Amino acid sequence: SQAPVYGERLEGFDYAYPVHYLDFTSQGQPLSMAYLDVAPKKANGRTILLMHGKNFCAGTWERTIDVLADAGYRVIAVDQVGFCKSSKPAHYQYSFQQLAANTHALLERLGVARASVIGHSMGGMLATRYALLYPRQVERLVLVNPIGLEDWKALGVPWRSVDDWYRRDLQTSAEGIRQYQQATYYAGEWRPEFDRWVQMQAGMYRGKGRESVAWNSALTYDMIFTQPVVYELDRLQMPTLLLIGEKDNTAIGKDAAPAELKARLGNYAQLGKDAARRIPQATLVEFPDLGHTPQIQAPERFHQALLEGLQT
Ligand SMILES: [Cl-]
Ligand SMILES: [Cl-]
């Protein structure tokens, strides 16, 4: 339907590639991580790991998967615990290290010794933590409009409790999602193909799993707010490519910030330059006219930059 209802683990919503699952135990819980694993026709000898944003899923990478597999990469796209088709635990203490370790464990089981890691938005923050933890196993890091290029709390963004994130998140609607995404993701543009991703998210808040979805969303908002990576960008040991749509204005808590602080948050035109300065081996690629999700807003241009930036 036009306002579809999806389950707690995105039951009813199809990814464009076959979905696999890995069962494991963490923090005393049985958990399941969904992932895509796509092989190239002719292997180039490299493997790519793709990490979704907070509000997107492994499936939202579909065009990037097609492009990279066609270029000869093995492509793995994983749904983190708390997200999408993976488990929504009743209880979990989230950290970027814990999620990175869960992912590292999956890559071990998939036989991957080393990968090039691409993270969008929250996935970028996570990819950063992954790269800090496992540098010998990350040959190249790519961050696509990552969050975490400024430490919001340190700028004066007011803290919100897990409980208050939870109550706020239960109000999520497709109308509200679209208002946010058209402005922040796509630089005021909209195309009908963007609607699939809005309804993917909105439909989880319609079903029987909506409280579990909201609770995990609250725990992961808390993780993003309390556990910055920005101070350690100077520790990154491999070449890092920053692909930044400069119309992005993403910042945690920007709507509860006073006007004077709103005006200063999420300035991606500056945040990219700042990150490039601090990362030892950085290459910055700016797209002046694209927003938070350049890979969806302008797929051909984004993919041409990414393929070239991945080359050794
Ligand atoms: Cl704080
Ligand atoms: Cl160190």
Structure token digits, residue 51? 């990490």
Separation between Cα atoms, residue 304 and residue 297, nearest integer Å: 14
CA 225 to ligand 1 centroid distance, Å: 8
- Whether 49 and 56 have beta carbons less than 8 Å apart is answered as no
Q: How many CB atoms lie within 10 A of CB 216?
A: 25
CA 149 to ligand 1 centroid distance, Å: 17
CA 142 to ligand 1 centroid distance, Å: 29
CA 279 to ligand 2 centroid distance, Å: 13
Q: Which of 200, 215, 228, 227 is nearest to 81 (CA)?
A: 215
Structure determination technique employed:
X-ray
Residue with tokens 């300065």: 277
Q: How many CB atoms lie within 10 A of CB 119?
A: 26
CA 280 to ligand 2 centroid distance, Å: 12
Looking from the CA of 83 toward its CB, the CA atoms found within 13 Å total: 24
Nearest ligand to the C-alpha of residue 252? 1
Separation between Cα atoms, residue 67 and residue 31, nearest integer Å: 31
Nearest ligand to the C-alpha of residue 234? 2
CA 250 to ligand 1 centroid distance, Å: 19
CA 65 to ligand 1 centroid distance, Å: 38
Sheet architecture: strand order including 74-78: 20-26, 29-38, 74-78, 47-51, 115-120, 138-144, 240-245, 282-287
Angle at 33 between CA 193 and CA 38, to 5 degrees: 60
Element (H or E) spanning 152, and its range? helix 152-155
Q: Based on C-alpha coordinates, what's the Rg of the chain? A: 18
Q: How far is CA 182 from CA 15, 72, 159, 171, 241, in A?
A: 23, 33, 26, 19, 26
Nearest ligand to the C-alpha of residue 153? 1
Could you give the 3-state DSSP secondary structure of residue 281? coil
Resolution (A): 1.5
Q: Which of 78, 59, 63, 55 is nearest to 174 (CA)?
A: 55
- Whether 285 and 309 have beta carbons less than 8 Å apart is answered as yes
- Whether 258 and 120 have beta carbons less than 8 Å apart is answered as no
Angle at 187 between CA 263 and CA 167, to 5 degrees: 65
Domain 1-312 top-level CATH class = alpha beta
CA 77 to ligand 2 centroid distance, Å: 28
Specify the amino acid at residue 183.
A
